[PDB]
């Protein structure tokens, strides 16, 4: 037959995350890979392959 769903496990709420994963450095500082792409464009403009 059919019957409504039991929510035994949802009703207890986790006050904490699952994983104790340490926070990375790059989440706090300006993005590095952005800056590498910036310096790529800088090298292309120094070679004049990209016009300002």
């Amino acid at each position: 037959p059919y019957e409504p769903l039991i929510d035994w496990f949802t009703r207890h709420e986790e006050v904490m995350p699952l994983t104790a994963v340490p926070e990375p450095k790059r989440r706090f500082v300006p993005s590095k890979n952005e800056a590498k792409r910036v310096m790529k464009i800088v090298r292309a403009i120094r070679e004049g392959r990209i016009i300002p």
């Binding site: 059919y2 409504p4 769903l5 929510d7 496990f9 949802t10 207890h12 709420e13 986790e14 995350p17 699952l18 994983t19 300006p30 952005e34 792409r37 910036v38 310096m39 464009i41 800088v42 403009i45 120094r46 990209i50 300002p52």
Partner: protein, 187 residues
């Protein structure tokens, strides 16, 4: 045609049969004005396009090319978050202040844990109607998920009242009928 015949015969065979209650939580979704204000919120937090990204990159790169190293200062980018594994990743920290969930995904099973997962994690989820409308606010075709974490101080008070609005409109209205087996009525 065949495909018109099947796409009309689809959603008949669904509603004719008993749907499990972990489905039909979908289409018990957000009403008109609240979804409207949610979109007004998230269009304030559109992510940067590839063109706008590359444009700012060319600006700062021409700056360094002159050099003319102007300063080293930028607060953070704030935007919506839209990668599905990234959306789940922002939960289980928790970081998701609001989550929008599209009702229509063809592999529904990608999505079905997310209401219960934000339920147990206490994240204010809301089921939105249409992943195309998610993709529009995130410069994709579809997105099917929409997480939002970081908000400016100008918008933070609007955020909290939107959360209270959703928890009044969604968590109070549809919670018991979420448990019930939907559909089953023939066509």
């Amino acid at each position: 045609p065949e495909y018109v015949r099947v796409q009309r015969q689809k959603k008949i065979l669904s509603i004719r049969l008993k749907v499990p209650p972990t489905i039909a939580q979908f289409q018990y979704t957000l009403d008109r004005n609240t979804a409207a204000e949610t979109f007004k919120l998230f269009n304030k937090y559109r992510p940067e396009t590839a063109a706008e990204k590359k444009e700012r990159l060319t600006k700062e790169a021409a700056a360094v090319a002159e050099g003319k190293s102007k300063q080293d200062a930028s607060p953070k980018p704030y935007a919506v978050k839209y990668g599905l594994n990234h959306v789940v990743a922002l939960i289980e920290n928790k970081k998701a202040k609001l989550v929008l969930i599209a009702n229509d995904v063809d592999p529904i099973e990608l999505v079905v844990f997310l209401p219960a997962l934000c339920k147990k994690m206490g994240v204010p989820y809301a089921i939105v109607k249409g992943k195309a409308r998610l993709g529009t606010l995130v410069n994709q075709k579809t997105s099917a998920v929409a997480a939002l974490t970081e908000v400016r101080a100008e918008d933070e008070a609007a955020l909290a009242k939107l959360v209270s609005t959703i928890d009044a409109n969604f968590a109070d209205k549809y919670d018991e009928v979420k448990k019930h087996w939907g559909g089953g009525i023939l066509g």
